[PDB]
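Consider the following assembly input.
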Amino acid sequence: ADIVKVAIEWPGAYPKLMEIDQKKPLSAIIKEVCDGWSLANHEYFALQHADSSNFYITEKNRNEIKNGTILRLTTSPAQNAQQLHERIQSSSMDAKLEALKDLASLSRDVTFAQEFINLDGISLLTQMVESGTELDMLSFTLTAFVELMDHGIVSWDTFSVAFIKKIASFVNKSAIDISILQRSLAILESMVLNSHDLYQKVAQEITIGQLIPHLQGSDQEIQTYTIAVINALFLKAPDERRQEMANILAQKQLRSIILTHVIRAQRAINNEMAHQLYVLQVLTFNLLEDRMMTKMDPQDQAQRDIIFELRRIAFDRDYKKLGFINHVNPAMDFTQTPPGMLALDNMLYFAKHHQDAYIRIVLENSSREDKHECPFGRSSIELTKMLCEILKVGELPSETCNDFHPMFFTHDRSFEEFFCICIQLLNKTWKEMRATSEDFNKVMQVVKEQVMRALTTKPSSLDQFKSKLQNLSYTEILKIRQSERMNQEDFQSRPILELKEKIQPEILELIKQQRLNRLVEGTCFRKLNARRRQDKFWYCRLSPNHKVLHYGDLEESPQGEVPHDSLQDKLPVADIKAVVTGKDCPHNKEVLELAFSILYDSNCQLNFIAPDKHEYCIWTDGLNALLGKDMMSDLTRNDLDTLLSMEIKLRLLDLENIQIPDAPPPIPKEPSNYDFVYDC
Amino acid sequence: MQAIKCVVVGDGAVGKTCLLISYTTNAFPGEYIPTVFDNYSANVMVDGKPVNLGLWDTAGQEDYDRLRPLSYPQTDVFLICFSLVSPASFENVRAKWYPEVRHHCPNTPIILVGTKLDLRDDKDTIEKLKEKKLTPITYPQGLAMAKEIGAVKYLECSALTQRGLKTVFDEAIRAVL
């Protein structure tokens, strides 16, 4: 039942074509194959792929075997691990090289790496790196090492301190062979990730001025693994020492170095380096969470002195002109976290580094005794809070995100600089709003809708961020987005398009009553060869009963209509066979597009030339009506759409700000009880 | 009500008898009692030509090439009949009553009509108009024909339908016009 067609090969023999039954154990299959090849000791053998990297097959992986694959019987994973443990330690350098190569090739397989770790080949490679002399061999050694340890069969804590110091020397010495550095950085990153004691041992063996210059290499993989070791030491670092590590990194210009040699480098940023810049970003933002959640002590005289100095720099009530809710004890306005102490750090930065903007924004609202003043204190509090919200201060890095704001890399204090920029834009929007203290929160939302709409443009530096903010309006771009989110979802959403077809025919008939009126009225026309005072123009009309016509003639006139009755008047209407258009009139190419003939009792017909494409729609469509046919012109369809726009408009007046379910919700089971307690 | 000397020439395959007899008995599309002695007649308060017509039917047969010649010399107009299921009608037209017009008068309104207009084109009239391999004549063959020998209008009417009837009777009256 569960069969897979396979060919099994062996050097020096012909392939055996087997219809492997997936219920039979692998051992029976290998025994059958060895018996067909007259090979004794079938238990010494297993099966692998003859194709690409040739993972050995286990009772689990055999399910991935596709039909027609070529497979090679070979030594068992245990036998491969044994021959590799023997040959990778051989005194012959060529044999050891080939063994290390084949081992780095086959170490990606979990079933072989099981056997290889179970013989402490990890220790063989460890000793080879620790005591190898004149150290290609080391590259395959370390590659096999990482492929072996990536399978989680033994703990990383089994590594001796000698190996840790050896790999730390390889990453710590002057630039060495590229592959050796890649593998050493990978081992270092992994051992920091899997063990805290290993991170302790690694942090003392490598310095910042060593992890930084590996970013100076032109190979982007070196850069990825270097910043990977950086972020590993950062994630495994204690919370108290994390700030000191960040200061030590900023002192060596880590930010500007990554700016000059990564984000503005010649090589484009790959996915993994984007992930690594993302985690470095989220941790650098996390460095502020500690100050985000700490409340001020209102009894601490130094913390109140900071408020007093921040008032003195501005003014030179007692706090009402600075904008705090608590006029006498503003420290209370800081006991709420978020933002708490981050708000104060930000506003003291705005006063010390951006003193001009600070004094401008405070003196523009310190003497306003009308209700239009912008309270700087409460605004800065809520603004540090909302910026902690939009950036998600305090979030842990994950594996799925690769995004970063490159702007932060242009300035050492781009966080507080951006704080100053957004308080400037806050008071700008406040003055543009004519808003009051009661409309505070609304304003904040606007500013949020402001900032959240700028970061999406990915500004390269803080000035581009400012320019984007200058471009944003309230809520004009949001109004455009709201008007655009409906035009797309009108037709491209089945839940909105479903009623577009139930009433659509009745919408056409609503048009068609107007077309019946336009039929009863009757309009002018044009007679062919109507030269020499013959009536070129000639009007029309029809009875209310839709069963008798009534039309007359006209002349070329400067003033207008002359409703003079002609002898061509009563043609009862139920007789109309069909109305043809264009060339099918029995008799300047433009008039032929306007030429169309009524066709009724066999040889009795009449030709027409409508006054315009408007009436060319009107007449042919009303004649489709007199015979019940659908309307053919696309102007009638334009009227159809102009209608169904307002007709779904009346309906969206009922489902505003509610997510339109494109997947229809299911009908629940019926109420088995039909005893309505409330009546009809 | 002014009556008129109406002598209705027209060949034997035409059948204007039933024609008149179904119009002016004034009953239905179809059923009217036909008649034998057939100077027929009809009218309307027609057009301020509020007039009656006295249809002078001789025998429609050929034994009258005097008695019919004794119906010509001063007939106001002549109803001159042919048909469509048999092109011989579309030919006798310049051929028989038309000479006979040339023959008694070169002055009066003289016109033509293909009867069997409603009969020209049955799959069975189509069918035995092909078996005889002549044509369920095009009225177009008409519009030439009537440009040709003198149909001052040219028409058709059928009393089964009781139709084309006034249409015919139209200027069959307003020949005055």
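The first strand of chain B starts at residue 5 and ends at 10. Ask yourself how this observation constrains the way the partners meet.
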